[PDB]
mmCIF file of C-alpha atoms (C1' of nucleotides) in Angstrom:
data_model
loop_
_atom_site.group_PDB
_atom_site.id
_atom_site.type_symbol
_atom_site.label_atom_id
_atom_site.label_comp_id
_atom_site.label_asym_id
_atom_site.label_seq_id
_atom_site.Cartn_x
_atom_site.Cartn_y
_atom_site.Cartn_z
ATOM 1 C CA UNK A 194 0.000 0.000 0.000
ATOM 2 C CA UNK A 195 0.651 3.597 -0.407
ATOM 3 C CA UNK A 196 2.072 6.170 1.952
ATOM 4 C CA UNK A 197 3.208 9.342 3.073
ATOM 5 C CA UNK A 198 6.866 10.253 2.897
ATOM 6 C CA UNK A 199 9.289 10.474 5.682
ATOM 7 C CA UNK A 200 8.355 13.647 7.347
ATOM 8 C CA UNK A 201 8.246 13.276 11.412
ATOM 9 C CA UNK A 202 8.698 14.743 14.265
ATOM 10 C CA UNK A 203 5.808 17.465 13.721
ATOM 11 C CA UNK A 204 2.456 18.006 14.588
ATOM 12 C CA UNK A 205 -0.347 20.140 13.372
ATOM 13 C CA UNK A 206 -3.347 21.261 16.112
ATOM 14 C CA UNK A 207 -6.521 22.491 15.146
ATOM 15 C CA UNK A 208 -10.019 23.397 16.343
ATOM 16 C CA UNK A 209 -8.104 24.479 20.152
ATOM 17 C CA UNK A 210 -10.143 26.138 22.944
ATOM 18 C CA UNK A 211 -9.169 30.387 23.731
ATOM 19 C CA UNK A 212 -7.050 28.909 26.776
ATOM 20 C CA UNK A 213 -5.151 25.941 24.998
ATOM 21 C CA UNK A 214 -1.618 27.864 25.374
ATOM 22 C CA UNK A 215 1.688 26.238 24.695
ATOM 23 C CA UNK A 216 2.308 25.020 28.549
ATOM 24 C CA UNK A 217 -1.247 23.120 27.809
ATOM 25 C CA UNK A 218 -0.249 21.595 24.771
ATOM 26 C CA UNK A 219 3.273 20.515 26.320
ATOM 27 C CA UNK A 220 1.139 18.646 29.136
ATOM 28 C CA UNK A 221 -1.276 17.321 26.546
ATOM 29 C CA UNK A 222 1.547 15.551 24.266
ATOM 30 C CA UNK A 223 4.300 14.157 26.433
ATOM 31 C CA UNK A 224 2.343 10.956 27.716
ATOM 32 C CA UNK A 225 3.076 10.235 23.912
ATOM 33 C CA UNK A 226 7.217 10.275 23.943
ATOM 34 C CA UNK A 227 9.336 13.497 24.769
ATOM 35 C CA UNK A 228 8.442 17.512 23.329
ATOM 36 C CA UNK A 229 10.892 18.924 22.411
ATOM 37 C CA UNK A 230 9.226 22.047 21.199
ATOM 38 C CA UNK A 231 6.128 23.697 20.621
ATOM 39 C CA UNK A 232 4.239 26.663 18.440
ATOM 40 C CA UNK A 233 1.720 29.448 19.331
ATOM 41 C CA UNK A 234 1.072 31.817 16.349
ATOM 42 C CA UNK A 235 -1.479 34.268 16.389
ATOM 43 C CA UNK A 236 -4.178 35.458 14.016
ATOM 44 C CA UNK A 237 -2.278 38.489 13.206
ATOM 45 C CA UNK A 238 -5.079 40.632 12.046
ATOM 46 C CA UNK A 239 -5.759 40.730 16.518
ATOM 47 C CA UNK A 240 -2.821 39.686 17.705
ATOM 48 C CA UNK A 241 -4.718 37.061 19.626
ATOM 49 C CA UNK A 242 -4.346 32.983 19.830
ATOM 50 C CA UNK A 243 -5.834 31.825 16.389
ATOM 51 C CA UNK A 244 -7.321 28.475 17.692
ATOM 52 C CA UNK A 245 -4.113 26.416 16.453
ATOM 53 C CA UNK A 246 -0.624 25.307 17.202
ATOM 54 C CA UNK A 247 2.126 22.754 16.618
ATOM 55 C CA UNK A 248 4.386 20.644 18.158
ATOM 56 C CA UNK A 249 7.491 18.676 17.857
ATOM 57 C CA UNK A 250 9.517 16.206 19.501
ATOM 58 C CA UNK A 251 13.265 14.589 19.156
ATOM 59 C CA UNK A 252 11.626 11.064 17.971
ATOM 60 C CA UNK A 253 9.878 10.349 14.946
ATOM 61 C CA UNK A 254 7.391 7.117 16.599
ATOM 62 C CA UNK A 255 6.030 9.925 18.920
ATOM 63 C CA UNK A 256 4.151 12.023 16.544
ATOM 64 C CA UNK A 257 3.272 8.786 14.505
ATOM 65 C CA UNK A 258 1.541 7.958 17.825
ATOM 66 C CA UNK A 259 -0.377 10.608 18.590
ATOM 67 C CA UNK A 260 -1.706 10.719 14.665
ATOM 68 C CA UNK A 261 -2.894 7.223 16.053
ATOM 69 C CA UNK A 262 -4.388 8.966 19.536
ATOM 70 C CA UNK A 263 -5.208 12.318 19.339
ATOM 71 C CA UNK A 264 -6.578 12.818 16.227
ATOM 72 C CA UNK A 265 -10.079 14.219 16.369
ATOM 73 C CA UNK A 266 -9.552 13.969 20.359
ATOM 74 C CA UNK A 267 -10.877 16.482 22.505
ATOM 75 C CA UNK A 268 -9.170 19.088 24.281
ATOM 76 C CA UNK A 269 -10.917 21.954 27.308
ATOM 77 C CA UNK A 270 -14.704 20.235 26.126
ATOM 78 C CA UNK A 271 -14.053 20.699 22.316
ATOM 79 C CA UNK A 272 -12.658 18.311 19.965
ATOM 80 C CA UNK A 273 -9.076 18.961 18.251
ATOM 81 C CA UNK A 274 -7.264 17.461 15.106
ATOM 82 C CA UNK A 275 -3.758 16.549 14.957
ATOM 83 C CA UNK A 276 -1.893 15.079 11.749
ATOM 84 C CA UNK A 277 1.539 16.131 10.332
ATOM 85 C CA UNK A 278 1.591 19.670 7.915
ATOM 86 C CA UNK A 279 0.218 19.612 4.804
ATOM 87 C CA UNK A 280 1.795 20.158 1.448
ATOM 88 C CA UNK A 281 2.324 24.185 2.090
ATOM 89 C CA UNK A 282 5.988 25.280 3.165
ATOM 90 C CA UNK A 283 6.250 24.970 6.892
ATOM 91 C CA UNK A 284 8.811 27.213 9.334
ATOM 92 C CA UNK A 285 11.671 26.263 7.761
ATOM 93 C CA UNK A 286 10.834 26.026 3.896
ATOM 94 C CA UNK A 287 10.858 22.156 3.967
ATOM 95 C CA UNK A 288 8.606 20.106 1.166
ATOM 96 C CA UNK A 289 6.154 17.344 2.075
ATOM 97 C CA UNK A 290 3.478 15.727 0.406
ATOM 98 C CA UNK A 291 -0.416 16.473 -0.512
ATOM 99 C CA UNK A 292 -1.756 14.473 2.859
ATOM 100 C CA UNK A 293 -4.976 13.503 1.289
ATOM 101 C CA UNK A 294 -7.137 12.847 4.028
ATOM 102 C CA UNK A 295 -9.800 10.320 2.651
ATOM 103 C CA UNK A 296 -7.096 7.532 2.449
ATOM 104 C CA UNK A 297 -4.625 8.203 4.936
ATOM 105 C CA UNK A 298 -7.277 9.009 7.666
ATOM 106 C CA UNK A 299 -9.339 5.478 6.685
ATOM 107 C CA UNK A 300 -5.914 3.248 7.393
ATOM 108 C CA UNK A 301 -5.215 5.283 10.262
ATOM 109 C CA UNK A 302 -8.951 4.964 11.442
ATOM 110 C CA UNK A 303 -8.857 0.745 10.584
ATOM 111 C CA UNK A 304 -6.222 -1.757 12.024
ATOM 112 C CA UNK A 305 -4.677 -2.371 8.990
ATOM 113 C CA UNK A 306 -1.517 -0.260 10.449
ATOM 114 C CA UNK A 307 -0.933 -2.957 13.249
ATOM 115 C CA UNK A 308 -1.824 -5.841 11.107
ATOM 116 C CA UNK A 309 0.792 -5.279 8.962
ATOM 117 C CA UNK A 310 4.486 -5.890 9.366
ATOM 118 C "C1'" A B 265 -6.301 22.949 9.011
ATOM 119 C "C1'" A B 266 -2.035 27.268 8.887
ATOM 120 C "C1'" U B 267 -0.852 34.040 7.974
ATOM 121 C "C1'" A B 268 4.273 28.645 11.911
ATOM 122 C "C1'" A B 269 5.345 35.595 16.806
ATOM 123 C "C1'" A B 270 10.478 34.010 18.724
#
RNA sequence: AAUAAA
């Protein structure tokens, strides 16, 4: 089967509650591995928390895990999506692929990635 | 899903 490239060790987070700050998304993640860093931009039309963040840690099997649980989770009674960056340029200019969500999300959603070996 | 504000 098909799959996305090698990018790791990042972590998109959507759909956050007004108080989900970076200290709250350290605590949310580390059960998962070890942070090793972690993103708060802001709107910047308010200069305000836009409702999204990232996060990255020093091992690539971390973020694969919490693809695997704590996407569409549920953070401060609201739920939350997490997946690796899509196919725009991320903080440092690097490349990844289109992340097509219909596929990816089913074999992530099924047991087919623990089947397999 | 993002306009990656340290």
């Amino acid at each position: 089967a098909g799959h996305m490239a090698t990018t790791k060790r990042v972590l998109y987070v959507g759909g956050l509650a007004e108080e989900v700050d970076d200290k709250v998304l350290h605590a949310a993640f580390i059960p998962f591995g070890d942070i090793t860093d972690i993103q708060i931009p802001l709107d910047y039309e308010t200069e305000k928390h836009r409702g999204f963040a990232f996060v990255e840690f020093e091992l690539a099997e971390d973020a694969a895990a919490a693809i695997d649980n704590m996407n569409e989770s549920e953070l401060f009674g609201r739920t939350i999506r997490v997946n690796l960056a899509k196919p725009m340029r991320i903080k440092e200019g690097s490349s990844r692929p289109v992340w097509s969500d219909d596929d990816w999300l089913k074999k992530f959603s099924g047991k087919t990635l623990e089947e397999n070996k």
